[PDB]
């Protein structure tokens, strides 16, 4: 049981901590987008209609 | 087996006094009432009519079953008491300790070595102690649950392992 | 769409052509990988369902169940590689073949855009499960058990076949979108009730409601571990998916004809949960608990209320994950004791301390303890039912009161109490069983943060 | 401020000036003081650092706008091509109206703590506004069924002036 | 936007840290209990600052943090509402449990799973200040079962004790009967008032909450262990002493009462509902006290003395006195929590014996424990100018000074006299007498952990109500012109009850034998409730489940009507079809019939 | 002897052959490797990033777009004084109700 | 490094991954037949940009 | 194992349809079901009656 | 609680029989069988074991209470019931 419990704290944290900094790092590097009005003569990109950068990137790369 | 009359009276005497203790509470009352309770017991000791003695113990416990304290006094360790199998959740069977990982077993070398002696002893003793059983078993199966001791020298009494290696009553 | 299907079926050649001993490994690898890809499908738009082609589409209801089925797929492989180790490689490969073939059908039916297409693999899931229950089942009465499970669903499914083709000849196509947009008020003509009965009874049977439920205790108990989970965590739920889809053209006939089922379900849950209070078999007790939770969804779906659908989808998933876990609990205990009687192995917590915990959140989750997804399901359903009628809360709340007693009843009888003296084969729990158990509980609490993912299209 | 004051009318706060007379020191002033130079300023120092970094590389995003499209009352019978646009438009307006009730509900709940013991009479305007919204919301979407569609909403509505005009005829007598 | 709102919430995030640290398992496996005790101490120290900010200004917060999820017109959000009923409760509640923690290490100094025990207490704690601090009904429902399930594990701390599991099963059962009323209120409020946040419910002025309030009342009765749903609390003494000292004394058992205080504004609009609130409180006061003065276990005495208090608390909320009832929560938190580890001190020191008939002469043996108990008992009786006086003496005067049910008012007076009655019984049997314990004496209280913990609440209980009453704004209506005859009733009845109870108690010293009175046979047996209601309804429902239900329907009828009947009919008509003779004479005869009937009889030709 | 059969095999303990046994399969090296797969391809890549993926999923159900429209719509409506949301949905002016 | 055998025993691991990249192909092929109303619905139909010729692929 | 068998399987083979078994099955079967039907039917037959003539209040009831 | 060891038991044991006025101190032996030589009536034997019961604080079952017969045997049954080995 002790070894098994140690395995989560290893393997979950194996990706947990790099994600933990990554989520914060994008929040200390480029920040959050602001609600700007639609500029004239330029339809936005499909992924552009999102404020959080990760959500925009997920929309950009996947959907 | 046979719950003969004298044990029933001793059952009556022991349990009634405990109930009487739960009533008087104060020691002087308990001591005082016990003696008169004792006095009214031994005074009728001459009855060649055992049936009459039984008749005297018809109303006896019926009065007790009326006179019984609804909350008798029990030491907590006994059944019904507050500390009944309170420390059971801690005691664990010894055989589970064989499962222990070798690193865990290495943490207690000499005691585990002592376990090996017990494991060794119980091995050959089993055949010896079981052999004593059939050679002296009464016909038609065991008549009484009491278990005969080790008749000869050296051999351990039969079925000794679980009683001897029973976990201690205060395990922590 | 395709990005899930071909990976699932192309997984089949891998298991067949893999090395002799690597079958469990590579199958587990990509089953989890398929789960990740399925999670990418979990996204949904506002109101229009995620439509892919004439053959496949997904909505906010199908997606949570899809990711659940793919998520399940590693778990049977994890749960089964203990009682199948001493088997010929071909039979192990065949066993794995059955699961992914079964799982492949589940992706197909949930994403099906046409009711008949939904219908064709609606019973096609039976064939792999019938093999799993019969061949690899570890009991004697599994043979009669498979017959009961097979015939009950067919007895209900075939009327749907006649009903479904009748829709095609009367209202053109049976595309789920085309039915919803061209819905017409079903009349009260005495034929329309038999119309209504046929379109409903098929989903009734494989969603055990009181009376039509005796297959489930025989289905679950004699089935092997992998068969029990798939049957209780997804299979009881094809009926659920059908009702949310097929009740589009059953109104307002559903308003009046709902009464016999609602009374049967609401009273049945009290009866069935009462059976749980006095079940001698641990697996049977979990099985009967599934009837009670499922019967709650029967009232949920058949009320036809926005809130009722939402709580249905909440209990839709939460019960499935929980029931699979409890079956894992019983299975992880069974082989150690080689018996199913609950009182056989008491006081397991003193011997296995971690399983005491795993059994503990498992019982709490089935308790609908807030904020677990089960509570969101039951509590949402109670409010929807209470709006429908004030009396039902007497029945509703009573179920929770009964659900409390039997849930901790298995906890006290098995985990707590005095360990059994005679047994001495209880070994320390393999970390596979431990890992699998967290594989179940951890996403459940992870789901608590985001109910909106599994609330459904009504959300 | 990020949000709009018109959407969220905030009556001006009446904060009394601190005029104590007892000579013994008022403690809560001190706990606020130490908090200011132990928590508030370090938080602000980090905040001004993060906010200036955010303005260093600023990326924008806008709000999607759906133009008006013919709805279900002018869509031809059957003709699911026009029904699709009609249904989606109606469901979008369903989302807006659900949020409209949400906005009103927050304003009603905002009064409760804001008005304190004066809640009962001070914001009766907030009460009637929610009453007007909730009643009108009932006439729009309530009892539409879990399979609600723009067809049913029109159907339920078409009953409303059916009864109303029938009542008007009776009222005219 | 002062630190008030910011740091009232961190107090919650302070004491959840020990839970996270434990899950790491790197946490100190030896000095863990000290870690949590100090953590709760800091959580307490932080908690005063919102308090001190309150009586000065009087601002109560509603913070709506991260939005969980929105349901069309519903916006269920994790929101904490720092009312006076809250902003006061966290300071006292942590103050009590911090002292309990200090007592806990001394008392449970040998339990091998002590780190688990302290983890459970914190987990119980977190479930508590999310219950009291609950701006929405849903997260109020979060605590209402979070504490209940936490009690089940804590009550069954000694898993092997078969009775402990039964008591643990008993606690969750009676709680769930009350929980039935809770969701009924939740369903009504969402259906009618279209919300669960307490703000919308108040503003939507549901001045006819007949079913809701009944649901709330039923919820309180289960949690606060009222008549019909009491016996779980007296039976909940099978757990360890600190467990009963914290949960089932003044922190979790009072939660049911706290529910009505939260929903007081809606209750006062109705008139019918508050009747059975004070009606249930009246019967609960008498019956629990009536069984109290005949029990023989200190835990049984104290627990019943609690339930009589919660009987008293609901009496005040009956006649529009919510905050005085909340005031009684404050005082009951101090002295009632005391009596337990004060009793726990004698229990552990005198070799874990809980039968009140084995002590005596402990006055000189444990002077501090004896000193602690007499202050606690006097506080419970309501001695003027100390703790209980600021609430109970006001309450007894309050309910008397109002238009109430005459029968209800009478029981409160009898209960108060009975409240002193069992107080004498404890002081008489346990302390004022002669030794009765086993010969080997091990009486000891010199451990600083026990001394510091008890003394910490002692200075708390001595003044107590003076500070709170003088600090809180004057926010209930004070009645002024009492006819002196009934204003003394707050003291007359207890002093009266002191007299005969002492006379009855030392009548045991009198040599005359005590004949078993039938009333004693009734009062001592928990008032006959457990003997019947825990044996008749349980047997019937269980017998129904097996004899009928499962066996009768599931395994006999439901398997015979649909499945077996069709199977029998198929088999009965499979055999006779297949049972043919093999002789063509009969087969061709059958064909001749078929040709004859088909051609003519069924009009197939025409 | 009824039939020439075999006695019921005894459940082997994976631990007594190799104490570090993880219960995934008999052979130690694959058993250790099965640990890596079930955890790395279990908790690690699915639970961690999958949660972040679904947590940071773009606007689902337009939960915030409707809010912004509602704020603008409600700001428009009470400015002119007309009721902030009409009791009717499909404008009755067009409706051509029968009789 | 034994590659003649690591390929034989671990060539199965590439099957599903190419299946996924295959699955996207039919996904990104079947949609072409479903063009029909491309930039035709008046909700989304708009002026076509100077360089790109297809709004949604 | 005898107890489990007698309580799980050895019921129907030993079951015999008799008036005691028959009546108890009907009493505990259709009985409660039809009873609840009547209770729910009349309650719903009063509820829709009130709203149909406008004799019930759902002014703030929207999330049904 | 300090470990109660068999030397302390017999010291406390013979303390009580010597206390019992029916058994005056002079002829107490560790194995002095009660009615065989001390003449203590068996009806009082079911009475001296409750004195032992309060002396050490626990209940003696009747199955062996009638068998608890000699002061050494009194000590012997005490030791194993509380795993007293030292
Ligand atoms: C610093 C920390 C950042 C954390 C960010 C948040 C967590 C990110 C976690 C990433 C993995 C989980 C998401 C898996 C998505 C699977 C792909 C999908 O949704 O559809 C297939 C997708 C979409 O199918 P498609 O390519 O046919 O879509 C056509 C439209 N475009 C081209 C614009 C995407 O496939 C691709 O985009 C092809 C490229 C390879 C994708 C590989 C995905 C798996 C590995 C990552
Ligand atoms: C700014 C951002 C700050 C960091 C946020 C990090 C994430 C977080 O905590 O978000 C909180 C937010 C809170 O939202 P919010 O409205 O408070 O806004 C966030 C920003 N702050 C906090 C600053 C206001 O909630 C979520 O993101 C929801 C997380 C849900 C996670 C669900 C995981 C599911 C995993 C499933 C695995 C199994 C799959 C297979 C089975 C499926 C079921 C059958
Ligand atoms: C108007 C103002 C009225 C004020 C009344 C005050 C009464 C105070 C209580 C007096 C009676 C109870 C009492 O004295 O209890 C203490 C005592 C306990 O005795 P017991 O439990 O038998 O233990 C004996 C051990 N040797 O001695 C006893 O005799 C216990 C008796 C138990 C039964 C008491 C019943 C009291 C009923 C009161 C009215 C209830 C409603 C009707
Ligand atoms: C184990 C038994 C079955 C279990 C329970 C299943 C559900 C119960 C009801 C089963 C109904 C099956 C047949 C329904 C097929 C589709 C019905 C449909 O679409 O509705 C038609 C309903 O019409 C019917 O007649 C349908 C069949 C009615 C029921 C009679 C036959 C079915 C029951 C007996 C056979 C099955 C039972 C088992 C026998 C061993 C509409 O046609 P109409 O009559 O309106 O046509 C226009 C005009 O009026 C003339 O046609
Ligand atoms: C508070 C009070 C409540 C109420 C409490 C009970 C008081 C009323 C009952 C009192 C006893 C009753 O009168 C008669 C009876 O049961 S029995 C009489 C003695 N006769 C025998 O029992 C048979 C022959 N004698 C022996 O068996 C031994 O002499 C004996 C074991 C007794 C002594 O030990 P030794 O000697 O073996």
From TrEMBL, chain A:
Annotated TM spans: 10-30
Cellular location(s): Mitochondrion inner membrane
Function, in words: Accessory subunit of the mitochondrial membrane respiratory chain NADH dehydrogenase (Complex I), that is believed not to be involved in catalysis. Complex I functions in the transfer of electrons from NADH to the respiratory chain. The immediate electron acceptor for the enzyme is believed to be ubiquinone.
Family recorded in the similarity comment: Belongs to the complex I NDUFB5 subunit family.
Assembly information from the UniProt record: Complex I is composed of 45 different subunits.
Protein name: NADH dehydrogenase [ubiquinone] 1 beta subcomplex subunit 5, mitochondrial
Organism: Sus scrofa (Pig)
Range covered out of full length: 64 to 126 of 189
From TrEMBL, chain D:
Coiled-coil stretches: none
Cystine crosslinks: 75-82, 111-123
GO cellular component, one term: mitochondrial inner membrane
Bias-annotated ranges (Basic and acidic residues): 2-13
Membrane topology: Peripheral membrane protein
Chain positions covered by the region annotation Disordered: 1-24
Keywords recorded for this protein, A-Z: Electron transport, Membrane, Mitochondrion, Mitochondrion inner membrane, Respiratory chain, Transport
Superkingdom, natural source: Eukaryota
Entry similarity comment: Belongs to the complex I NDUFB10 subunit family.
Name this protein carries in UniProt: NADH dehydrogenase [ubiquinone] 1 beta subcomplex subunit 10
Source species of the chain: Sus scrofa
Source lineage: Eukaryota, Metazoa, Chordata, Craniata, Vertebrata
Residue span relative to the full protein: 126 to 298 of 299
UniProtKB/TrEMBL annotation, chain H:
Domain of life of the native organism: Eukaryota
Subcellular location field: Mitochondrion inner membrane
Family assignment from sequence similarity: Belongs to the complex I NDUFB4 subunit family.
Summary of subunit composition and partner proteins: Complex I is composed of 45 different subunits.
Job of this protein: Accessory subunit of the mitochondrial membrane respiratory chain NADH dehydrogenase (Complex I), that is believed not to be involved in catalysis. Complex I functions in the transfer of electrons from NADH to the respiratory chain. The immediate electron acceptor for the enzyme is believed to be ubiquinone.
Name of the protein: NADH dehydrogenase [ubiquinone] 1 beta subcomplex subunit 4
Organism: Sus scrofa
Coverage span on the entire protein: 66 to 129 of 129
TrEMBL record, chain I:
Listed GO CC annotations: mitochondrial membrane; respiratory chain complex I
Coiled-coil annotated residue ranges, if any: none
UniProt entry tagged with the keyword Amino-acid biosynthesis: no
Location(s), subcellular: Mitochondrion
Predominant place of localization: mitochondrion
Keyword Mitochondrion tagged: yes
Keyword terms: Electron transport, Fatty acid biosynthesis, Fatty acid metabolism, Lipid biosynthesis, Lipid metabolism, Mitochondrion, Phosphopantetheine, Phosphoprotein, Respiratory chain, Transit peptide, Transport
GO terms for biological process, alphabetical: fatty acid biosynthetic process
Domain of life per record: Eukaryota
Residue intervals of the Carrier domain: 7-82
Family: Belongs to the acyl carrier protein (ACP) family.
Role played: Carrier of the growing fatty acid chain in fatty acid biosynthesis.
Protein name: Acyl carrier protein
Full-protein interval shown: 71 to 156 of 156
């Amino acid at each position: 049981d002790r070894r098994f419990l140690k395995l989560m704290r290893f393997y979950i944290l194996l990706t947990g901590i790099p994600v933990a900094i990554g989520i914060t790092l994008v929040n200390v590097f480029i920040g959050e987008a602001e609600l700007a009005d639609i500029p004239e003569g330029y339809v936005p990109e499909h992924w552009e209609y999102f404020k959080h950068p990760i959500s925009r990137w997920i929309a950009r790369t996947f959907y | 087996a046979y719950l003969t009359h004298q044990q029933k009276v001793l059952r009556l005497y022991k349990r009634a006094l405990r109930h009487l203790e739960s009533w008087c509470v104060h020691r002087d009352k308990y001591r005082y009432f016990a003696c008169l309770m004792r006095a009214r017991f031994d005074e009728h000791k001459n009855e060649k009519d055992m049936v009459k003695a039984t008749q005297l113990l018809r109303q006896a416990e019926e009065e007790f079953w009326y006179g019984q304290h609804p909350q008798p006094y029990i030491f907590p360790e006994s059944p019904g008491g507050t500390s009944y199998e309170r420390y059971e959740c801690y005691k664990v069977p010894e055989w589970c300790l064989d499962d222990w990982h070798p690193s865990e077993k290495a943490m207690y070398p000499d005691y585990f070595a002592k376990r090996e002696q017990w494991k060794r002893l119980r091995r050959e003793s089993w055949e010896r102690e079981v052999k004593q059983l059939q050679e002296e078993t009464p016909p038609g199966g065991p008549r009484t649950e009491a278990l005969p001791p080790a008749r000869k020298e050296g051999d351990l009494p039969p079925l000794w392992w679980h009683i001897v290696t029973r976990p201690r009553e205060r395990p922590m | 769409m395709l990005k899930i299907i071909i990976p699932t079926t192309m997984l089949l050649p891998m298991t067949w052509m893999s090395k002799h001993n690597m079958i469990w490994i590579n199958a587990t690898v990509h089953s989890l990988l398929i789960s990740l890809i399925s999670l990418s499908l979990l996204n949904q738009l506002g109101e229009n369902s995620l439509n892919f082609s004439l053959t496949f589409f997904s909505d906010s209801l199908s997606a949570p169940l899809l990711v659940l089925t793919t998520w399940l797929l590693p778990l049977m492989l994890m749960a089964s590689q203990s009682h199948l180790s001493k088997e010929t490689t071909t039979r192990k490969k065949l066993y794995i073949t059955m699961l992914i073939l079964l799982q492949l059908f589940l992706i197909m039916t949930f994403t099906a855009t046409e009711l008949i297409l939904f219908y064709i693999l609606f019973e096609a899931t039976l064939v792999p499960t019938l093999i799993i229950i019969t061949r690899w089942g570890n009991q004697t009465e599994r043979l009669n058990a498979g017959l009961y499970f097979l015939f009950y669903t067919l007895a209900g499914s075939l009327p749907l076949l006649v009903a479904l083709v009748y829709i095609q000849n009367t209202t053109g196509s049976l595309n789920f979108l085309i039915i919803h947009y061209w819905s017409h008020p079903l009349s009260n003509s005495w034929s329309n009730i038999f119309m209504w009965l046929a379109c409903i009874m098929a989903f009734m049977v494989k969603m055990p409601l009181y009376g039509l439920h005796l297959w489930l205790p025989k289905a679950h108990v004699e089935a092997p571990i992998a068969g029990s989970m798939v049957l209780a965590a997804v299979l009881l739920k094809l009926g659920g998916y059908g009702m949310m889809r097929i009740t589009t053209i059953l109104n307002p006939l559903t308003n009046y004809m709902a009464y016999p089922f609602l009374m049967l379900s609401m009273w049945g849950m009290i009866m069935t949960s009462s059976i749980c209070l006095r079940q001698t078999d641990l697996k049977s007790l979990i099985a009967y608990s599934s009837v009670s939770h499922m019967a709650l969804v029967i009232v949920a779906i058949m009320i036809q209320t926005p809130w009722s659908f939402m709580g249905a989808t909440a209990l839709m998933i939460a019960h499935g994950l929980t029931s699979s876990m409890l079956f894992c609990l019983a299975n992880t205990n069974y082989e150690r004791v080689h018996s199913r009687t609950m009182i056989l192995a008491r006081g397991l917590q003193t011997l296995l301390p971690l399983m005491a915990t795993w059994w503990l959140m498992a019982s709490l989750t089935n308790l609908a303890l807030p904020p677990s997804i089960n509570l969101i399901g039951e509590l949402f359903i109670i409010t929807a039912s209470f709006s429908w009628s004030n009396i039902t809360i007497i029945l509703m709340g009573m179920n929770m009161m009964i659900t409390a007693l039997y849930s901790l009843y298995m906890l006290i009888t098995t985990q707590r109490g005095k360990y059994t003296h005679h047994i001495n084969n209880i070994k320390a729990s393999f970390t596979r069983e431990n890992a699998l158990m967290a594989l179940h509980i951890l996403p459940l609490l992870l789901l608590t943060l985001n109910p909106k993912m599994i609330l459904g299209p009504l959300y | 401020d990020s949000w709009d004051k018109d959407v969220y009318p905030e009556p001006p706060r009446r904060t009394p000036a601190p005029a104590p007379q007892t000579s013994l020191p008022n403690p809560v002033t001190y706990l606020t003081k130490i908090f200011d130079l132990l928590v508030d300023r370090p938080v602000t120092l980090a905040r001004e650092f993060i906010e200036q970094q955010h303005a260093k590389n600023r990326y924008y995003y806008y709000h999607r706008e759906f133009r008006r499209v013919p709805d279900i009352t002018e869509c031809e019978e059957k003709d699911i091509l026009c029904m699709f646009e009609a249904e989606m438009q109606w469901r979008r307006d369903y989302k807006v109206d659900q949020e409209i009730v949400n906005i009103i509900q927050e304003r009603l709940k905002a009064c409760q703590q804001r008005e304190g013991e004066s809640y009962r009479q001070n914001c009766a305007k907030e009460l009637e506004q929610f009453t007007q919204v909730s009643k009108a919301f009932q006439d729009r979407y309530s009892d539409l069924g879990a399979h609600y569609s723009a067809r049913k909403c029109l159907a339920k509505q078409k009953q409303r002036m059916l009864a109303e005009r029938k009542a008007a005829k009776e009222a005219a007598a | 936007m002062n630190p008030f709102a910011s740091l009232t919430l961190t107090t919650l995030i302070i004491l959840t840290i020990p839970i996270m640290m434990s899950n790491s398992n790197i946490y100190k496996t030896n000095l863990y209990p000290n870690y949590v005790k100090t953590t709760v101490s800091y959580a307490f120290t932080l908690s005063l600052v919102p308090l001190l900010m309150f009586m000065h200004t009087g601002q109560e917060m509603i913070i709506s943090n991260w939005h969980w999820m929105t349901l069309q017109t519903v916006e269920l959000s994790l929101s904490f509402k720092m009312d006076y009923f809250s902003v006061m409760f966290i300071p006292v509640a942590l103050f009590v449990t911090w002292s309990i923690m200090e007592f806990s290490m001394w008392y449970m100094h040998s339990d091998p799973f002590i780190n688990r025990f302290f983890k459970y207490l914190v987990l119980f704690l977190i479930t508590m200040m999310i219950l009291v601090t609950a701006n929405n009904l849903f997260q109020l429902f979060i605590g209402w079962e979070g504490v209940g399930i936490m009690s089940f594990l804590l009550i069954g701390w000694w898993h092997g004790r078969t009775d402990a599991n039964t008591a643990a099963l008993q606690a969750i059962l009676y709680n769930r009967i009350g929980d039935i009323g809770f969701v009924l209120s939740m369903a009504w409020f969402l259906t009618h008032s279209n919300a669960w946040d307490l703000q919308q419910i108040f503003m939507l002025n549901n001045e006819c909450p007949n079913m809701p309030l009944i649901g709330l009342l039923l919820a309180a009765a289960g949690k606060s262990a009222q008549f019909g749903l009491h016996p779980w609390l007296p039976s909940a003494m099978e757990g360890p002493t600190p467990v009963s000292a914290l949960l089932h004394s003044s922190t979790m058992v009072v939660a049911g009462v706290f529910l009505l205080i939260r929903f007081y504004p809606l209750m006062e609009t109705n008139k019918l509902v508050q009747t059975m609130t004070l009606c249930l409180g009246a019967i609960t006061t008498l019956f629990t006290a009536l069984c109290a003065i005949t029990q023989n276990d200190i835990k049984k005495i104290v627990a019943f003395s609690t339930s009589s208090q919660l009987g008293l608390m609901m009496v005040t909320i009956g006649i529009n006195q919510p905050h005085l009832a909340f005031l009684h929560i404050c005082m009951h938190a101090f002295f009632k929590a005391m009596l337990f580890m004060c009793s726990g001190s004698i229990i552990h020191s005198l070799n874990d014996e809980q039968d009140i008939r084995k002590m005596g002469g402990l006055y000189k043996a444990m002077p501090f424990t004896t000193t602690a108990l007499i202050i606690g008992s006097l506080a419970l009786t309501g001695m003027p100018y100390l703790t209980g006086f600021y609430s109970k003496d006001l309450i007894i005067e309050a309910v008397n000074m109002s238009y109430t049910n005459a029968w209800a008012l009478l029981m409160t007076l009898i209960a108060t006299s009975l409240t002193a009655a069992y107080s004498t019984r404890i002081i008489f049997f346990a302390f004022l007498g002669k030794p009765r314990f086993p010969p080997l004496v091990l009486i000891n209280e010199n451990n600083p952990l026990l001394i510091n913990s008890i003394k910490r609440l002692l200075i708390g209980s001595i003044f107590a109500g003076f500070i709170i009453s003088n600090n809180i704004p004057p926010m209930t209506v004070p009645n002024t012109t009492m006819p002196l005859y009934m204003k003394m009733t707050a003291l007359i009845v207890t002093i009266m009850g002191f007299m005969l109870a002492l006379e009855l108690n030392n009548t045991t010293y009198y040599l005359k034998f005590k004949y078993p009175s039938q009333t004693y046979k009734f009062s001592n047996m928990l008032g006959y409730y457990p003997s019947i209601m825990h044996r008749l309804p349980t047997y019937h429902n269980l017998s129904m489940s097996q004899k009928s239900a499962s066996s009768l329907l599931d395994l006999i009828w439901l398997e015979t009507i649909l499945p077996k009947t069709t199977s029998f009919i198929q088999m009965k008509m499979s055999i006779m079809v297949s049972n043919q003779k093999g002789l063509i004479k009969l087969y061709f005869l059958s064909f001749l019939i078929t040709i004859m009937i088909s051609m003519t009889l069924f009009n197939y030709h025409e | 002897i009824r039939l020439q059969e075999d006695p019921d095999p005894e459940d082997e303990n994976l631990y007594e052959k190799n104490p570090d046994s993880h219960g995934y399969d008999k052979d130690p090296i694959v058993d250790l490797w099965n640990m890596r797969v079930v955890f790395f391809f279990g908790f690690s890549i699915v639970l961690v990033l999958g949660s972040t993926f679904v947590a940071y999923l773009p606007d689902y159900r337009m939960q915030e777009w409707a809010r912004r429209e509602a704020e603008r719509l409600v700001k428009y409506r009470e400015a002119n004084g007309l009721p902030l949301m009409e009791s009717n949905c499909f404008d009755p002016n067009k409706i051509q109700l029968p009789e | 490094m034994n590659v003649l055998q690591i390929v034989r025993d671990h060539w199965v691991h590439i099957l599903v991954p190419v299946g996924f990249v295959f699955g996207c192909y039919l996904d990104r092929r079947s949609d072409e037949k479903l063009t029909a109303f491309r930039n035709k619905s008046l909700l989304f139909k708009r002026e076509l940009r100077p360089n790109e010729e297809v709004t949604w692929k | 194992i005898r107890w489990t068998y007698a309580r799980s399987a050895n019921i129907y083979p030993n079951f015999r349809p008799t008036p005691k078994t028959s009546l108890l099955g009907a009493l505990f079967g259709i009985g409660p079901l039809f009873f609840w039907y009547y209770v729910f039917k009349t309650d719903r037959d009063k509820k829709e009656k009130l709203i149909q003539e406008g004799k019930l209040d759902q002014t703030f009831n929207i999330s049904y | 609680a300090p470990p109660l060891t068999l030397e302390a038991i017999k010291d406390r044991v013979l303390y009580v029989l010597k206390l019992y006025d029916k058994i005056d101190p002079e002829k107490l032996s560790v194995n002095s069988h009660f009615m065989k030589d001390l003449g203590l009536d068996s009806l009082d034997q079911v009475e001296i074991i409750m004195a032992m019961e309060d002396e050490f604080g626990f209940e003696i079952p009747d199955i062996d209470a009638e068998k608890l017969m000699c002061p050494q045997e009194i000590v012997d049954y005490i030791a194993d019931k509380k795993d007293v080995y030292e």
